[model samples]
Target: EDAMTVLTPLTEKDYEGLKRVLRSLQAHKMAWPFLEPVDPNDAPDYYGVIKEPMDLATMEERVQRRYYEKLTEFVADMTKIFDNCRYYNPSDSPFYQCAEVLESFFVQKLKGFKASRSH
Candidate 1:
């Protein structure tokens, strides 16, 4: 089965980079779950503490900040997989390739989410 389908246009570099990452991730058996911490309840649950009802304003200003932070942290951690490994060159770095794939995935997903919210 096809692992993923891209609905939007992407540059050749972006497409190749994404494919490389996806393949590497698959090879390493690290791409099974799209995001870590399987359960939604396992995620941080600060929503219940807010005074007002959940709304876009709250999500954009508060929740998104933390979410982006967590995303950045995840990328940082994944990067360590490449440090001094010497198994791959920059031209063929699986980590670099995979990171681009993940970034594209996030961008597409985020755009879709925003579009959905706008409607």
Candidate 2:
């Protein structure tokens, strides 16, 4: 048996579903229990993947670490751009609203999420 699984290559239907998962990260960061292998549990609706047989804290730590590794320059710069852009100065626009919600729930909430899972 393999010690790790690395998932990639999403179909259109699953890509859409993964976006839905990201959308909820802000509201649900604290509750993101990684699914058991081949099990029905889910929140991401993502065909996106990574997994191991482990406790919740162990699973989440691996996910968080790998996600941290997966960041890119373009993504970093643009999320930074959007971060400032949407936070102030005519904040009623669509991207601004997205920015406001995502920052509060996803980025900031992650600290609390990690803290809760810490052993």
Candidate 3:
């Protein structure tokens, strides 16, 4: 048999089906392995990795930190370009929309990993 290829544009129905499958698999395998039973006396203090009052000062300090400054700058530049191009034409602006979504996803994941590691 010839190699099967999926070159056609994926329709809403196809995406919905794919999402359903993914959710089903995730639900089946989901578990709370990381959470431990809490003890009243052994209550641990929870500290946020991203400092409180997220402002220019905190942001500047974070940018100066050795771990993430370069990566943050790269993402910020990409975000600026995406915002600039997004307003040029709304109808055919999938690239900007995708970039915005991807950047948000990247930031969330990066922050989450940082927070988790710090904790």
Candidate 4:
């Protein structure tokens, strides 16, 4: 086995923490709408408003495929999921409320994960 590192700095080991957080997000009570891709037929305007549709399922797939080379990429994608929801739904809507709470929770988890890793 080789001990030398690859050209890309962060590998799945660095991402293992994020992946664990993702599963936590997926299991959250507010994660229902974000569990899968939004259906265009169900909400046609969503496609127009949220051009880049992201979901937990897609993110999990990306993780498995090792599509993320940077931690920010994973963070951005997770952020996108919440951002899109807020953009498409009204402030008072349940979905928008869910996004807000989940986004905050995710940020808190990410910070905790980062701290745990470095020290």
Candidate 5:
């Protein structure tokens, strides 16, 4: 599809940014899709595609939209790495490790959602 044109590979800086999301994702509940937005107010409207102000209905949607864009791009790049190294299934393969990290990252989000509804 148009979205899967293959990312140009993540840089060393990207590794840092990608992992950084784990902590941010925890501190911020907006990324949690299961919740409903209460109201607009002072949402994180400052965190959109920098310098390219998007004209969305609200800042909350803008932030969420940007997050999805980033996640999809990361996954698209991971898919490329996967297609190239289809036969390389070593335990320490960088691609495999990255994929596992992403999987665990998402799994943690699911666990957070559960913890919220328990009490």
Candidate 6:
């Protein structure tokens, strides 16, 4: 028996579905904060705190370039985006809530994608 379960590349339909999820995320009002990369010039300390920064625009570009080899890669980046925001902003901050709300939305979207893919 094979020791490993090889994962297949995403089909064209899956790739397009991924793009749709991203669009929905970007359309959210809270998405403004995550629409573009954090300007290092504006917040020098942000880089020092966040080892790996992530944003919706960056993710969109990565998807366009087909840089995501696996679903986990996309999830990792999404998690990083929220984690970084939560860490940098206080719990009472609106930005922190934005991250929390967006994360929940993403989680549900990802689950739906997986469910649809399995059927």
Candidate 6 Cα misplacement greater than 4 A, ranges: 1-8
Residue 85 local lDDT, model 3: 37
Query: What clash pairs does model 1 have?
Result: 21-98
Between candidates 1 and 5, the lDDT winner: 5
Cα TM-score of candidate 3: 0.29
lDDT of 1 by residue, 2-115 (tens): 112222333344333433433444444433332322233642442343222222232234332443232333233344333312222254766446545654564554444334
Locate the minimum summed-lDDT window of 10 residues in model 3: 29-38
Q: Which of the two candidates, 3 or 5, achieves a greater TM-score against the reference?
A: 3
Compare candidates 2 and 5 on TM-score and give the better one: 2
Error of 4 at 73 (Å): 1.0
Candidate 1 lowest-lDDT run of ten:
1-10
Q: Model 4 over residues 61-88: C-alpha lDDT tens digits?
A: 9988889876666778988998888888
lDDT of 2: 0.37
Alpha-carbon lDDT, every model? 0.37, 0.37, 0.34, 0.82, 0.39, 0.84
TM-scores of the candidates in the order shown = 0.29, 0.30, 0.29, 0.87, 0.26, 0.88
lDDT of 6 by residue, 1-119 (tens): 11111254567878898999999999998888899999889878998988888899999999999997777777788889999999998999998999989988998998788777768
Q: Which ten residues in a row have the lowest lDDT in candidate 6?
A: 1-10
lDDT: the better of candidates 3 and 5: 5
User: Which tens-of-lDDT digit does each residue in 1-119 have in candidate 5?
Assistant: 22322333434443444444444443443333212322236435423322322221233353434443433554443333323232334567664554455445555753443344324
Candidate with better TM-score, 2 vs 6: 6
Once fitted onto the true fold, the runs of candidate 2 whose alpha carbons sit more than 4 angstroms away are: 1-23, 26-67, 70-81, 84-90
Ten-residue stretch with the least lDDT total in model 2: 1-10
**Top of the candidates by TM-score:** 6
